[PDB]
Scaffold this active site. Structure first.
Site, PDB file in Angstrom:
ATOM      1  N   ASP A  73      50.286  19.984  36.621  1.00 20.20           N
ATOM      2  CA  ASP A  73      49.555  21.123  37.171  1.00 20.20           C
ATOM      3  C   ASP A  73      50.085  22.489  36.735  1.00 20.20           C
ATOM      4  O   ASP A  73      51.269  22.771  36.866  1.00 20.20           O
ATOM      5  CB  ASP A  73      49.576  21.038  38.698  1.00 20.20           C
ATOM      6  CG  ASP A  73      48.661  22.059  39.354  1.00 20.20           C
ATOM      7  OD1 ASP A  73      47.421  21.866  39.315  1.00 20.20           O
ATOM      8  OD2 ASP A  73      49.183  23.052  39.904  1.00 20.20           O
TER       9      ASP A  73
ATOM     10  N   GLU B 277      47.414  20.256  32.189  1.00 19.30           N
ATOM     11  CA  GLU B 277      46.323  21.025  32.779  1.00 19.30           C
ATOM     12  C   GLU B 277      46.595  22.449  32.307  1.00 19.30           C
ATOM     13  O   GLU B 277      47.359  23.191  32.929  1.00 19.30           O
ATOM     14  CB  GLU B 277      46.340  20.979  34.317  1.00 19.30           C
ATOM     15  CG  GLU B 277      45.017  21.424  34.982  1.00 19.30           C
ATOM     16  CD  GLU B 277      45.180  22.629  35.912  1.00 19.30           C
ATOM     17  OE1 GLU B 277      46.289  22.807  36.468  1.00 19.30           O
ATOM     18  OE2 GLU B 277      44.196  23.389  36.100  1.00 19.30           O
TER      19      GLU B 277
END
Ligand SMILES: OC[C@H]1O[C@H](O[C@H]2[C@H](O)[C@@H](O)[C@@H](O[C@H]3[C@H](O)[C@@H](O)[C@@H](O[C@H]4[C@H](O)[C@@H](O)[C@@H](O)O[C@@H]4CO)O[C@@H]3CO)O[C@@H]2CO)[C@H](O)[C@@H](O)[C@@H]1O
Ligand SMILES: OC[C@H]1O[C@@](CO)(O[C@H]2O[C@H](CO)[C@@H](O)[C@H](O)[C@H]2O)[C@@H](O)[C@@H]1O
Length: 628
Positions: free
Chosen positions: A286, A328
Site C-alpha cells: 500500500d 500499489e
C-alpha cells in the site's frame, strides 16, 4: 559491512552447545543458510544504500535476522513447500491460468466464516487469486475503509478472530486459491500503540513518525507536496491536540511511519513475517511511493523508497520465498513501472491500462490505449501487470501528459473532459459516476462509481452489458494477472446510502463499495437478465483465458487496425484480439488483414471469421481470433 556467514554464526549463539549441533544439521537451517548466502548481499546493500553508517544499522540487522530465522523455523511445512515451488518457478504470476478477485469481507460475505462459505462460488467463477480488504483492527467509525490500522495482529472483531483468518487462508489454499492481503506499511492509525507512545514521548518509540513543533517544516515541505485527499486537509500534515504537527499524507487519522529510522523498518519487517506465516501468498504494498521523504522533493518515488522495498523483498527471499509483492503505485507511468522487478515488486497494478480503458469508452478513440499497449505494456522478466477494470478506489486519470502531447492532446484539458463525462456533466454521457477529491487549487478530480454505474447499467443503457464485457476482455487477455472487482460479474450498481451515512458521506468512494447483492447473484444463471448476461460472458472469457495457452505470459504486440475506434493486439503470435470501442459498427478492412489467414476461429462468439474480406464488428464487440 558484515557478511552472511558472520551473522549466521551469531544467530546460532542462542542455542546451547548441544542444541546448536542439532540446528546446524536440520533441513530448515540448511535452506535458511543457503537463502541467506544468496539473498543477504542484496538486503545489506539496499539497507546500506539507505541508512549508511548509521550506528543502529548493524544492531537492527542482527535483531531482524534472528527473527527471520525464528519465523522461518516456525513456518508451517505446507508453506515451506510453496516456498520451494515458487523459488523454482518465478513466473507462476505470469500464467494465463491465474485470475484474481477482490472484495471486502464484511460487504461481500458478512464476516470471515461467511467468506469461507463463499469459496465454492469463487471456484465456480474460476478465481485462483483472492484479495481481502483490510482485516485488522482500526478506529470505529472512520478508518479509511480499514486502511488506518490500529493493530497489525488483532483482527477486526466484527470480522472474526486471527484463528478464523488462519482458517480462511487454509480453505483458500485447499480450493486452489491464493490469499492476498494488504501491507499498509507507509502509515498506521493514530490509535495504534506506536503512534500513542511516540507522541507521548516514549523513548522506545522515538522518531517512529514525523512530528513537528510547528508549521516551519510543514510549510517548507508543502511547497512540493501533492494532496491526495485535499477534502480532508491541505498539504501533507495534520495538527495534534498539543499543537504539534504530524505528517499525514492521507487522512488525519493516518500517520506516516518514519523509515528514516531503521528501527521502523525492522518493526514492519517483523509484521511482514507475521503475515507471511499466516500463509499469505501476495502482499499488496500500500502506497509504496510515499515511504521516503526529502525536503524540496515531492516525497514520492524517491530512490530510498525503492531501496527499502527491495530490502523487504530480500527478507521474504530469505524467510518466506513464497511471498510475492503487489505494488500499489497510482502515479505517473514512468514512475509506476519502476516498482516492478523481480527484486522489488514482482507484480503491480496497471493504472495506465485501467484508466485508458475508461478513457476510450468516453472518446471512442483507442489512440491513447494503443500507445500504452505499444510502448508501456511489456515488462522485465519474472514480473507481471495486475490488470483491472475498477477497484475499491476512485479512478484517477494517470496517463502521461507527455504521451498525450505526442498525440496532440492536452492532458489538462482532456482530464477536465473525462471528469465531466464520467460524472454525467457532459451531453449524452452514459456514465453515472460521482466526483472524488475535486481540488479547486489544481483542477484535478477523480471519479467514483461501479463498473456498471459508469457504463450506463443504472439506466439500462442497451450498450451497458457489452461495455462491461469489452473492458474486462482486455484486462483478461493483454497479458498479466487480471483482477475482478467482485460484484462486477453481475453488474452491481452504486451503494445508495453512503451519502446518508455520516461516517461515509465525505468519501464518495463508498458509492462503489456496495454490499453483496443477493438479487443479482440469484440471476447469474438467467441469460435474460443483465446479471446473467454479464456473468456468463465473463465466466466464458475466464474459462478461455485459463485453458488456452495462447494467452500465457504478459508480452503483447499491438496490431494497427487502421480504424481509430478499434484496438488490436496479438498474444504469442497466435491470438489476435480486436475491440470496438464505438457504439456503432466499425470495420477492419480486408487490406489491413492481408497478412492474416483467410479464416480464424473466434473464441468469443464461437464462430469462424473470414479475414480475406472486410471485417465488420458490431457495437462494442470483442473478438479473440486464433491465427496460430
Ligand atoms: O459517439 C460519441 C461521440 O463521438 C464523437 O465525439 C467524441 C470525440 O470524437 C472524441 O475525440 C472525444 O472528444 C473530446 C476530447 O477527447 C477531449 O480532449 C476534449 O477536447 C477538448 C480539448 O481537450 C481542448 O484542448 C480543446 O481543444 O477543446 C476540446 C473540446 O472538444 O473534449 C472532447 C469532447 O468535447 O469525445 C467525444 C465525445 O465522445 C462525435 O463527434 C460525437 O458527435 C459523438 O456523439
Ligand atoms: O458529490 C457527492 C459527495 O461526494 C463528496 C464525498 O467525496 O465530495 C466529492 O464531491 C464534491 C462535489 O463534486 C467535491 O468538491 C469533493 O472534492 C469530492 O470529494 C461529498 O462531499 C459530496 O456531498
Amino acid at each position: 559491512s558484515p557478511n552472511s556467514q558472520y551473522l549466521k554464526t551469531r544467530i546460532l549463539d542462542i542455542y546451547t552447545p548441544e542444541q546448536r549441533a542439532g540446528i546446524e544439521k536440520s533441513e530448515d537451517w540448511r535452506q535458511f543458510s543457503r537463502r541467506m548466502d544468496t539473498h543477504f548481499p542484496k538486503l545489506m546493500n539496499e539497507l546500506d544504500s539507505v541508512y549508511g553508517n548509521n550506528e543502529a544499522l548493524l544492531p537492527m540487522l542482527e535483531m531482524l535476522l534472528a527473527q527471520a530465522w525464528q519465523s522461518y523455523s516456525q513456518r508451517n511445512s505446507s508453506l515451506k513447500d510453496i516456498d520451494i515451488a515458487r523459488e523454482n518457478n518465478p513466473d507462476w504470476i505470469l500464467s494465463n491460468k491465474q485470475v484474481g478477485g477482490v472484495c471486502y469481507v464484511d460487504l461481500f460475505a458478512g464476516d470471515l466464516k461467511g467468506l469461507k462459505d463463499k469459496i465454492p462460488y469463487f471456484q465456480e467463477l474460476g478465481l485462483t487469486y483472492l484479495h481481502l480488504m483490510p482485516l485488522f483492527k482500526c478506529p470505529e467509525g472512520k478508518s479509511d475503509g480499514g486502511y488506518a490500522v490500529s493493530s497489525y495482529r488483532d483482527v477486526n472483531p466484527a470480522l472474526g478472530t486471527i484463528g478464523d483468518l488462519r482458517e480462511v487462508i487454509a480453505a483458500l489454499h485447499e480450493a486452489g486459491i491464493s490469499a492476498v492481503v494488504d501491507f499498509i506499511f507507509n502509515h498506521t492509525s493514530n490509535e495504534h500503540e506506536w503512534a500513542q507512545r511516540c507522541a507521548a514521548g516514549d523513548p522506545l518509540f522515538d522518531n517512529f513518525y514525523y512530528i513537528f513543533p510547528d508549521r516551519r517544516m510543514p510549510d517548507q515541505y508543502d511547497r512540493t507536496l501533492r494532496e491526495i485527499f485535499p477534502d480532508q486537509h491541505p498539504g501533507g500534515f495534520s495538527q495534534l491536540e498539543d499543537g504539534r504537527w504530524v505528517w499525514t499524507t492521507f487522512n488525519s487519522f493516518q500517520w506516516d511511519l518514519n523509515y528514516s529510522n531503521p528501527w521502523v523498518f525492522r518493526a514492519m519487517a517483523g509484521e511482514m513475517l507475521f503475515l507471511a506465516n499466516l500463509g499469505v501468498d501476495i502482499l499488496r504494498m500500500d502506497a509504496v511511493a510515499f515511504i521516503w521523504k526529502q525536503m524540496g522533493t515531492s516525497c514520492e518515488n524517491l530512490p530510498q523508497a525503492h531501496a527499502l522495498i527491495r530490502a523487504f523483498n530480500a527478507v521474504m527471499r530469505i524467510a518466506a520465498p513464497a511471498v510475492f509483492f503487489k505494488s500499489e503505485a497510482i502515479v505517473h507511468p514512468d514512475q509506476v513501472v519502476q516498482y516492478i522487478g523481480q527484486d522489488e515488486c514482482q507484480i503491480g497494478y496497471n493504472p495506465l491500462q485501467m484508466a485508458l480503458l475508461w478513457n476510450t469508452l468516453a472518446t471512442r478513440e483507442v489512440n491513447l490505449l494503443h500507445q500504452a499497449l505499444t510502448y508501456r505494456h511489456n515488462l522485465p522478466e519474472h514480473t507481471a501487470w495486475v490488470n483491472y477494470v475498477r477497484s475499491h478506489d476512485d479512478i484517477g486519470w494517470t496517463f502521461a501528459d507527455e504521451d498525450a502531447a505526442y498525440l496532440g492532446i492536452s492532458g489538462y484539458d482532456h482530464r477536465q473532459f473525462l471528469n465531466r463525462f464520467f460524472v454525467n456533466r457532459f451531453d449524452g454521457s452514459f456514465a453515472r459516476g460521482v466526483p472524488f477529491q475535486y481540488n479547486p487549487s489544481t483542477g484535478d478530480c477523480r471519479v467514483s462509481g461501479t463498473a456498471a454505474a459508469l457504463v450506463g447499467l443504472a439506466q439500462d443503457d442497451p450498450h451497458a452489458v457489452d461495455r462491461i464485457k469489452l473492458l474486462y476482455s482486455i484486462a483478461l487477455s493483454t497479458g498479466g494477472l487480471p483482477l475482478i472487482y467482485l460484484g462486477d460479474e453481475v453488474g452491481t450498481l452504486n451503494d445508495d446510502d453512503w451519502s446518508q451515512d455520516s461516517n461515509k458521506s465525505d468519501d464518495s468512494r463508498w458509492a462503489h463499495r456496495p454490499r453483496y447483492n443477493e438479487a443479482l447473484y440469484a440471476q447469474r444463471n438467467d441469460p435474460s437478465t443483465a446479471a446473467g448476461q454479464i456473468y456468463q460472458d465473463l465466466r466464458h472469457m475466464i474459462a478461455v483465458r485459463q485453458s488456452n495457452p495462447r494467452f500465457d505470459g504478459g508480452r503483447l504486440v499491438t496490431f494497427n487496425t487502421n480504424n481509430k475506434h478499434i484496438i488490436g493486439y496479438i498474444r504469442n503470435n497466435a491470438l489476435l484480439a480486436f475491440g470496438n470501442f464505438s457504439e456503432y459498427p466499425q470495420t477492419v478492412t480486408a487490406h489491413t488483414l492481408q497478412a492474416m489467414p483467410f479464416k480464424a476461429h473466434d473464441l468469443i462468439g464461437g464462430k469462424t471469421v473470414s479475414l480475406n474480406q472486410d471485417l465488420t464488428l458490431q457495437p462494442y464487440q470483442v473478438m479473440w481470433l486464433e491465427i496460430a
